[PDB]
Scaffold this active site. Structure first.
Site, short mmCIF file in Angstrom:
data_model
loop_
_atom_site.label_atom_id
_atom_site.label_comp_id
_atom_site.label_asym_id
_atom_site.label_seq_id
_atom_site.Cartn_x
_atom_site.Cartn_y
_atom_site.Cartn_z
N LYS B 154 -2.98 -6.48 6.82
CA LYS B 154 -4.34 -6.95 7.06
C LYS B 154 -5.19 -6.71 5.83
O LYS B 154 -5.83 -7.64 5.32
CB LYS B 154 -4.96 -6.23 8.26
CG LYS B 154 -4.23 -6.46 9.57
CD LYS B 154 -4.95 -5.78 10.72
CE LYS B 154 -4.83 -4.26 10.64
NZ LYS B 154 -3.42 -3.81 10.84
N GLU B 180 -12.49 2.34 8.48
CA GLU B 180 -11.19 2.35 7.82
C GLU B 180 -11.05 3.59 6.96
O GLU B 180 -11.67 4.62 7.23
CB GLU B 180 -10.99 1.10 6.97
CG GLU B 180 -10.71 -0.16 7.77
CD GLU B 180 -9.41 -0.09 8.58
OE1 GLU B 180 -8.31 0.06 7.99
OE2 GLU B 180 -9.49 -0.18 9.83
N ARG B 181 -10.24 3.50 5.92
CA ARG B 181 -10.02 4.64 5.03
C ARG B 181 -11.04 4.65 3.89
O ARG B 181 -11.27 3.63 3.25
CB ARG B 181 -8.61 4.56 4.44
CG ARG B 181 -7.49 4.44 5.46
CD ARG B 181 -6.14 4.43 4.77
NE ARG B 181 -5.05 4.38 5.72
CZ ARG B 181 -4.78 3.34 6.50
NH1 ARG B 181 -5.53 2.26 6.44
NH2 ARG B 181 -3.76 3.40 7.36
N1 LIG Z 1 1.47 -9.08 0.42
C1 LIG Z 1 2.20 -7.96 0.46
N2 LIG Z 1 3.30 -7.84 -0.38
C2 LIG Z 1 4.05 -6.69 -0.32
N3 LIG Z 1 3.84 -5.64 0.45
C3 LIG Z 1 2.74 -5.79 1.27
C4 LIG Z 1 1.90 -6.88 1.34
N4 LIG Z 1 0.90 -6.70 2.26
C5 LIG Z 1 1.16 -5.47 2.76
N5 LIG Z 1 2.25 -4.87 2.19
C6 LIG Z 1 2.88 -3.56 2.42
O1 LIG Z 1 2.40 -2.88 3.55
C7 LIG Z 1 1.54 -1.79 3.09
C8 LIG Z 1 0.17 -1.66 3.65
O2 LIG Z 1 -0.33 -2.83 4.30
P1 LIG Z 1 -1.84 -3.04 4.58
O3 LIG Z 1 -2.43 -4.28 3.98
O4 LIG Z 1 -2.66 -1.84 4.21
O5 LIG Z 1 -1.80 -3.04 6.13
P2 LIG Z 1 -2.94 -2.96 7.17
O6 LIG Z 1 -2.76 -4.07 8.08
O7 LIG Z 1 -4.33 -2.98 6.57
N6 LIG Z 1 -2.65 -1.62 8.00
P3 LIG Z 1 -3.71 -0.72 8.70
O8 LIG Z 1 -5.03 -1.17 8.43
O9 LIG Z 1 -3.46 0.72 8.32
O10 LIG Z 1 -3.43 -0.89 10.17
C9 LIG Z 1 1.43 -1.88 1.62
O11 LIG Z 1 1.31 -0.57 1.12
C10 LIG Z 1 2.69 -2.56 1.25
O12 LIG Z 1 3.78 -1.72 1.15
MG LIG Z 2 -6.04 -1.60 6.64
#
Ligand SMILES: Nc1ncnc2c1ncn2[C@@H]1O[C@H](COP(=O)(O)OP(=O)(O)NP(=O)(O)O)[C@@H](O)[C@H]1O
Ligand SMILES: [Mg+2]
Ligand SMILES: Nc1ncnc2c1ncn2[C@@H]1O[C@H](COP(=O)(O)OP(=O)(O)NP(=O)(O)O)[C@@H](O)[C@H]1O
Ligand SMILES: [Mg+2]
EC number: 7.1.2.2
Lengths: 37, 469, 94, 123, 466, 466
Positions: B154, B180-181
């Site tokens: 996300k 968030e963080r």
């Molecule tokens: N486009 C991408 N390419 C490669 N790895 C990715 C990509 N998007 C996310 N990731 C991987 O997944 C991890 C974290 O995803 P992230 O965008 O922070 O998720 P999120 O949905 O915001 N999770 P959260 O908010 O904690 O519920 C990254 O540290 C990467 O290892």
């Molecule tokens: Mg996030």
């Protein structure tokens, strides 16, 4: 219900396996051919 | 008018007024604190006592402590001078860059634009993300929802949408941090400072920052969303100018409220959420929209508890979007990014009479072959790759390629993939999938389509792949 | 147990179940048990065995589905019951 | 980062092959690193390794130099090996740390040791 | 001072005091009653009223009835004269053998040993049970828990452990019956007088029995454990001996706590339990322990309601154990006894530096082949074993001989197994398995390893089968 | 005595009576309304205040509005003149055919017959419908679960039964539409008129209708089953008849119960139903049995929640059933009517000691031949119906003759089918199938047994069609 099998484990790793294995050799199979062409 | 605190249980504090009783939604200043402490009037308990949720910690409050009614709801600084500045939930600046000398303050609480105020215009907004622009295109000034279980993409995805669409935006952009963080706030700030979207030495800054992250008590996270929304409101009306509104995880707006419901004396509803879940979300979302005065191109990140989309919080958030991009652990797990689900991401403009017939057919053509492939996932799960008629095993082989061609390296995700982020033009995307569905590239290996830009690199990579063998 | 998971295995095993029953008929018309097994380690038969195999396989899946579904409902009832007790404890705590 | 290069996805990619385990020599290989690296990752408690010691052994596996060894033998090998580098080759490790990098001369002096040491090990 | 009952609800009794309010835990004696009825002060409601818990039925109580403050918690007899006797929650003898003339008495409530009194000595305690001996050895001075569902194997196991361990024990033991079957105490009592661990004439008895079976009201079943516990503490500290403390079902202590919590005015926690489940439990389990002053090898049978190991009760019990023996109904239903789960029973002693690498290496060999067989069960149920490689079939086969070779006939169960009991040594168990794994017996039939002692008896039974 | 409404919260109303307080279950009449608004007592809150559940809307009510204690519970018109008429929850005619001129009245709340008033004889209520009487007999004074959605012959089997029981037993019938849809309720009314069971002219009506529309509040929808019950009771205790009670959707009664329960603020039991589930089902169901005077048999349509037989509702309902009539589209398609499944419909009374050894062995033979034929289906289609041994060729044939002989033309179908309906006596059905099983009628074509009555019409139909 379309692809419930795969959305699990036991038989999924299988489907996952055979799958990749197949396309693995196939592609190599197609790979050198690219050279030919 | 001055009131006295009469009860303090968590983020819920009771203040009794003898003089006049402040109206609900009114901000209350707690006297005697080395840091402004705002109390929002939530209810009228009766007997000249109001119940309020604290916009900060209650560590240290004393029964009987004075409380000055500011006369109105939380009003924060709005206008161009916010640009480049990191704002609080109550308008306080948190960048240590001094005060935000604004000439106008708006209440984070306000009515939603009437129906006569709604706009019916829909212009596809190109993002360079093949999957997005292919299956569920975003629309100019529309409401974008990005769903996803924990860590599926996300945050990275919304980041790409800022590196792609915001940087090349001829106008202002608001970003609100919602539970968030704080580390991500750091990252985004310093990274915007690099790209120059934020200028610390002059006035060219084009994005305003609002934050109320995790370390913050629910009350705050329960309002920051409205704070950031107010800042973007001013940019939509008092200008008409185009505004981009990024909210990282509106879900923290509903959890915030879910973390103080009980203490507000409320029988819990299904799954523990507040009974007011859907309507709070309503008087909150309806405000984030495009009116006939200006347009807001919003991109909200929506969390999905335990990955369950049917969870009340997310299931109630859908109808508020004009375009949804759903992320899938399953997909991410197959190392496909963005982990967008091709079979669960939809868009309002996905109509042939808005994107043309060519664009539409290919999209559904993608989705269909991908649904057929799910049907064979089962059949081959017991049989093996050697039973499907040459016709079916042919589609399986195209599904894989079309599946892989939906993945795409992000400029923002270099540090992750290690590759060079690519950006695909719409037309090159359709062509790209039009040709693969045609059967043209049935001689190329799947891997050739994995993590690339336009359909060409595929062939090119495929070549770099032939020579290496 | 988790409603989400059970629902996943049921669908998945209901699918398998369908495909195996279909194979039993094809075989009937015409993996073949321990047929290829025996000769290597050392048609009529081949099809015989395949018929048999898918048959049993078909039953074995149905007997499995029949057991997952009971677990489905037990667990379905439990979740409702849980959600409700939570809903009331909060109300009786007001 | 060098030797750990892309071992991670590779391992997770070995899992893709894990569902099978008349394999073709090729995939038999994907299933040949993963089974080797795995043993090289196992470890003892209260006996941590200097980042340089870890690179030295991880190197021996990742550079395919142990692909023709019996898995169950890997662990017994890490021991003997390590005790060797840590004994006779104090200076080699002494570098890798100082430069936290595997230079050319160090990629060589390590290939020299694993392959010969390994063979003397499979005597 | 005199206190008066102001309210009665099942086993919770509010007593109001006009002068001198009894502190929490203080034991009040209800007046005007045929047999001694103790109430335990649980809280101060305010308005000089205390809410207590009855240690016996509260039938007949009348509001206004007088309650006396003993001025101290529930104190029971501790010492050598308890040995061979049977006592209830409140220390009264219930074996129809008269008063228990002990010098010292002890409160059944006490603080747990301090962090500086903790013992870090690990030393296996071989039991003769191949599965426990092998995969999750018990530890002398350790906390052994035996989880099991209704009718799976807890009791029989505790009994066998009293047979194979208690007897060859040089010291004092304490058996605490908590919320289980009264006729079982009956059984135990008479089995002990037989074997002689209990002597009604000469003062040579070695077992102290505390009981509060499933016939007792919640307040009792909720404290009996503390009583048996307190009787074990005396032997440990005030005598410095190696004390064995068996408790058939400590789960009853928690269950009971739930019945009364309801009536105490506590908002209920998950699954209806009390909020204090974790703490309540802690303040007790923490006393069941070995200190520097002495040792306590405790064996606790643990009931799993509705066979659900995630139930707050059992769940919360694992962290308090040094060794866990999880019993399974599915395993029992395949006729494998003891129905021990090879893949869900653990011991902090399963460490190569402690039981040797030969022992640890075999243990892990067994938990690996069974683990690998378990992951194949998905395929076996749909496509049979004709769809397994040649390699697979081999493990399946060895797993099945290992599973069975894990069973074992206990003396205490001869009636249900129809086989003479067996006590297998450690080396013999290590050996037996090293061999099945190495494929040394891949020629014998499954049924040959089922219900036998050492491996040798696996072979004998094979020939007989021809 | 007059009360004053002091509390209205939806379908719940609390009334304060200064002097005489109305017992529980006592109907109160709200004063000052166009239609009649009845409030059934439910609790005595104390302070001369009673709580109640309204039987119709509560909009318009005001605190202080007068309320009258009707002296007893909800009383309705009972007796012959109710037949053919459609009665409301509280006894009001809703068929607009004016008043329900009866000399008698009764309370909807009546204790079930006492133990002595009980019948100890197990008699079978002959329906004249072959499948029913042969494979799943209706216990006289027993409850029968009617399984089958819509479009399977439900409305036809219901009336036919009404007809038969009337023709061969003199007893009337009542239809309690619990939670009925005003639409189908209307459809049923006319479908019955054009069927004969109801006559808007000459008193020849055999059924009394009672409705509890969905738009009606949970209070209303909960009592209907009783109103209609009270009606049927008159014909059993007053005219010694063997009535027939139809409760379409016993489920919606249950649900109606939970909603009342919740509205009253009671804590739901498992799966959200009312704690009182079993008692709510007890008090009502038990008013249906055989008494010295006569008997009431009831056919209650059942809805299985989430297709889960274990869900509380049904499972609480299966405790009171003696039989189940299962309708099947699979059967309806084949043109077999009634579409009663011969293998899923069953009876407790289908025991030798009850239906006679003779009757038993016949029903059993038919059940087993169908079971045998249902299996064969595979082979027949695949392996080809050419390699069927003598014993295999007869089964399929006979089974088909049986299977079709299970079809029966209803007298209520005459209106459209253009075929004289048939009412087969138990004697004829037993022998009919008894013979078919022997083989006495193997020299006849299938269609000969299709849609007929006694076995005679089978042969007579055979010759004609040659
Ligand atoms: N486009 C991408 N390419 C490669 N790895 C990715 C990509 N998007 C996310 N990731 C991987 O997944 C991890 C974290 O995803 P992230 O965008 O922070 O998720 P999120 O949905 O915001 N999770 P959260 O908010 O904690 O519920 C990254 O540290 C990467 O290892
Ligand atoms: Mg996030
Ligand atoms: N070691 C064993 N050998 C043979 N049968 C056994 C064994 N252990 C348990 N059983 C069987 O299971 C039955 C009862 O087990 P038991 O020891 O009473 O279980 P439990 O754990 O104490 N259950 P419960 O007290 O009811 O919760 C016995 O009657 C035996 O049939
Ligand atoms: Mg027991």
């Amino acid at each position: 219900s379309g692809d419930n099998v795969r959305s699990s484990a036991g038989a999924v790793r299988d489907a996952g396996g055979a799958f990749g294995k197949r396309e693995q050799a196939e592609e190599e199979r197609y790979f050198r051919a690219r050279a030919k062409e | 008018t001055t009131g006295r605190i009469v009860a303090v249980i968590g983020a819920v504090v009771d203040v009794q007024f003898d003089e006049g009783l402040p109206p609900i939604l009114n901000a209350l200043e707690v006297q005697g604190r080395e840091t402004r402490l705002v109390l929002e009037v939530a209810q009228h308990l009766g007997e000249s006592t109001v119940r309020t949720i604290a916009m900060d910690g209650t560590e240290g409050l004393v029964r009987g402590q004075k409380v000055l009614d500011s006369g109105a709801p939380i009003r924060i600084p709005v206008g161009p001078e916010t640009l480049g500045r990191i704002m609080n939930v109550i308008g306080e600046p948190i960048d240590e860059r001094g005060p935000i000398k604004t000439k106008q303050f708006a209440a984070i609480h306000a009515e939603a634009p009437e129906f006569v105020e709604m706009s019916v215009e829909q212009e596809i907004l190109v993002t360079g993300i093949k999957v997005v622009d292919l299956l569920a295109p975003y629309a100019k000034g529309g409401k974008i929802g990005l769903f996803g279980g924990a860590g599926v993409g996300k945050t990275v995805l919304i980041m790409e949408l800022i590196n792609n669409v915001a940087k090349a935006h001829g106008g202002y952009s608001v970003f609100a941090g919602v539970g968030e963080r704080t580390r991500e706030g750091n990252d985004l700030y310093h990274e915007m400072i690099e790209s120059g979207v934020i200028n610390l030495k002059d006035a060219t800054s084009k994005v305003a920052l609002v934050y109320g992250q995790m370390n913050e008590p629910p009350g705050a996270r329960a309002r920051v969303a409205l704070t950031g929304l107010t800042v973007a409101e001013y940019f939509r009306d008092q200008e008409g100018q185009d505004v981009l509104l990024f909210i990282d995880n509106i879900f923290r707006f509903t959890q915030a409220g879910s973390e103080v419901s009980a203490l507000l004396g409320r029988i819990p509803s299904a799954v523990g959420y507040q009974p007011t879940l859907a309507t709070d979300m309503g008087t909150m979302q309806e405000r984030i929209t495009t009116t006939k005065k200006g347009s807001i191109t919003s991109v909200q990140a929506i969390y999905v508890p335990a990955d369950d989309l049917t969870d009340p919080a997310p299931a109630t958030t859908f109808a508020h979007l004009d375009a949804t991009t759903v992320l899938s652990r399953a997909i991410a797990e197959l190392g496909i990014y963005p982990a967008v689900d091709p079979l669960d991401s939809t868009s309002r403009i996905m109509d042939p009479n808005i994107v043309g017939s060519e664009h539409y057919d290919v999209a559904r053509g993608v989705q269909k072959i991908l649904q057929d492939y799910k049907s064979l996932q089962d059949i081959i799960a017991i049989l093996g790759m050697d039973e499907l008629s040459e016709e079916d095993k042919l589609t399986v082989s195209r599904a894989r390629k079309i599946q892989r061609f939906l993945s795409q390296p992000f400029q923002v995700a270099e540090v992750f993939t290690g590759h060079l982020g690519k950006l695909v033009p719409l037309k090159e995307t359709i062509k790209g999938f039009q040709q693969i569905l045609a059967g043209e590239y049935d001689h190329l290996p799947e891997q050739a389509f994995y993590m690339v830009g336009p359909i060409e690199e595929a062939v090119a990579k495929a070549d770099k792949l032939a020579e290496e063998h | 147990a988790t409603l989400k998971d059970i629902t996943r295995r049921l669908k998945s095993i209901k699918n398998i179940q369908k495909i195996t029953k279909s194979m039993k008929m094809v075989a009937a018309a015409k993996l073949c048990g321990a047929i290829h097994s025996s000769v290597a380690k050392q048609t009529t038969s081949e099809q015989s065995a395949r018929m048999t195999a898918m048959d049993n396989a078909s039953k074995n899946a149905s007997e499995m589905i029949d057991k997952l579904t009971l677990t489905f409902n037990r667990t379905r009832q439990a979740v409702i019951t849980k959600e409700l007790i939570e809903i009331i404890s909060g109300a009786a705590a007001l | 980062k060098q030797v750990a290069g892309t071992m991670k996805l590779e391992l997770a990619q070995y899992r893709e092959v894990a569902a099978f385990a008349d394999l073709d020599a090729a995939t038999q290989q994907l299933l040949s690193r993963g089974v080797r690296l795995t043993e090289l990752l196992k470890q003892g408690q209260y006996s941590p390794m200097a980042i340089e010691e870890q690179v030295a052994v991880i190197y021996a596996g990742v550079r395919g130099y142990l692909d023709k060894l019996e898995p169950s033998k890997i662990t017994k090998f890490e021991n003997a090996f390590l005790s060797h580098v840590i004994s006779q080759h104090q200076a080699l490790l002494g570098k890798i740390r100082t430069d936290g990098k595997i230079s050319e001369e160090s990629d060589a002096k390590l290939k020299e040791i694993v392959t010969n040491f390994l063979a003397g090990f499979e005597a």
